[PDB]
Amino acid sequence: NLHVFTIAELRAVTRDFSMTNFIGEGGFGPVYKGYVHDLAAQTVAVKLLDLEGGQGHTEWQTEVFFLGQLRHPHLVKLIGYCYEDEHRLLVYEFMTRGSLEKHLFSLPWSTRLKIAIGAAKGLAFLHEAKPVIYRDFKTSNILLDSDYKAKLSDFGLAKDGPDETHVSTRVMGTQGYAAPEYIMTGHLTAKSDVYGYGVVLLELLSGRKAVDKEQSLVEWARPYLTDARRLDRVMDPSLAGQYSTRAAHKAAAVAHQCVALNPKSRPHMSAVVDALEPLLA
Ligand SMILES: Nc1ncnc2c1ncn2[C@@H]1O[C@H](COP(=O)(O)OP(=O)(O)OP(=O)(O)O)[C@@H](O)[C@H]1O
Ligand SMILES: [Mg+2]
C-alpha cells in the first residue's frame, strides 16, 4: 500500500529540499523533485506542509485517505507519506510536465482535447465510485506526463458524497472555479465539481484565465458558446485552423452546459466523456 517515510529519508530523497529541486507550491506548501533508490526506483514529488500557512493536518489526512484507496489511470499516484512530530509530507509519482496552468498561462488543439478528456475520465471515476466529490477542481490541479496525459492531483479538499441530496461543509476552494450555488449556500454536490470542470474546459478553449482583474471568463464568454457562428470571439487565436467548426462548437456547448448556474442542468461527467472523446478522432 502506502510507504511510510521519515524526515531523514525525504531529506536524502530531495537533496535536503534544495531550491534546484523546487517544482511548485500551493496553500499546503512547496513541492520538491526527489529520487528514490533501490518500491521501484523513480522520480517522485515531495509536498511539505507549511506550518504557518492556512492548511494543515486535515488536508494531509484527506489526501492519504482518498489517494491511498483511489486507483485509476487519470488520478495521480500517492507513493507514501511522512508524519513525524509537527511535520507532514506527501510523496507522489513525479508528473514530468507539471501542472496545466503553467502550460496554458502553444498547446495544440488535439493536446487540449486529450487533456480535457483525461481530466473528465478522472472526475467521472470519482463521481461513479462510495462516490467522492473532488471540490477543488481547477487548472493547476491537472498534472501532465510526457505524453500530456492528464491526471487529477491534490485531494486536500476531497469529500465523501451524500438518501441525502447534498453535503454541508465550509466554503472552500478557489475563486472562479468553485461552483456558485456552493459558494452561496455551503451545500456541496458532485454537480459542483462539474462547474469547475466547465471552467477549465473554457480555459483550454480560449487560452484565458477563469479570473483576470470581462474579468470573469464564464460571465463574459457565457452567451457566446451556444452559436457556432460566434466561435471566433471565444476560441484562443493561437488555435486557428487546427479545429473544425463542429469540434470546437461541441466542446464549447459542453462547456456551456457544465457552467450552468442551475446545478440540475449540468451533465454527468460520464456524458461529458462521451461528448468529447469523438472530437479527438
Ligand atoms: N506529482 C507532481 N509532479 C510534478 N509536479 C507537482 C506534483 N505535485 C505537485 N506539483 C507541483 O506543485 C504544485 C503544488 O502542488 P499541490 O497542488 O499538490 O499543492 P497544494 O498546496 O495542495 O495546492 P492548493 O493550494 O490547491 O491546496 C502543483 O500545482 C504542481 O505544479
Ligand atoms: Mg491542496
Author numbering: 2 to 39, 45 to 111, 117 to 140, 142 to 174, 177 to 227, 233 to 300
What is the paper's account of this structure, in its own sentences?
We identified ScRIPK, a member of the RLCK VII subfamily, by a screen for sugarcane orthologs of Arabidopsis RIPK and rice GUDK. Thus, ScRIPK is a member of the RLCK VII subfamily localized in the plasma membrane. Furthermore, bacterial growth was measured to determine the bacterial proliferation inside plants, showing that transgenic plants exhibited significantly higher bacterial proliferation than that in wild-type plants at 3 days. Like the typical structure of protein kinases, ScRIPK-KD contains a small N-lobe, composed of five β-sheets and an α-helix, and a large C-lobe, composed of six helices, an activation loop, and a catalytic loop.
The catalytic spine is completed by the adenine base of ATP, which binds to the V103 (from the beginning of the β2-strand), A122 (from the conserved Ala-Xxx-Lys of the β3-strand), and L226 (from the middle of the C-lobe β2-strand). We also analyzed the ScRIPK-KD activation loopresidues that mediated the kinase functions. This activation loop contains three phosphorylation sites, namely, T250, S253, and T254, as indicated by the electron density. The ScRIPK kinase domain adopted an active conformation with a salt-bridge formed between K124 and E140, similar to the active conformation of other kinase proteins, such as IRAK-4, BAK1, and BRI1. In addition, we determined the location of the DFG-Phe residue and calculated its distance from two conserved residues (K124 and L144, labeled as D2 and D1, respectively) in the N-terminal domain, revealing that it belongs to the DFGin group. By analyzing the Ramachandran region annotation (A, B, L, and E) for the X, D, and F residues of the ScRIPK X-DFG motif and the DFG-Phe χ1 rotamer, we found that the ScRIPK-KD structure was in the BLAminus cluster. Furthermore, the regulatory spine (R-spine), which determines the positioning of the protein substrates so that catalysis occurs, was assembled in the ScRIPK-KD structure. The R-spine contained residues from the activation segment and the αC-helix, which assembled by the L155 (from the beginning of the β4-strand), L144 (from the C-terminal end of the αC-helix), F238 (from the activation segment conserved DFG motif), along with H/YRD-Tyr217 of the catalytic loop.
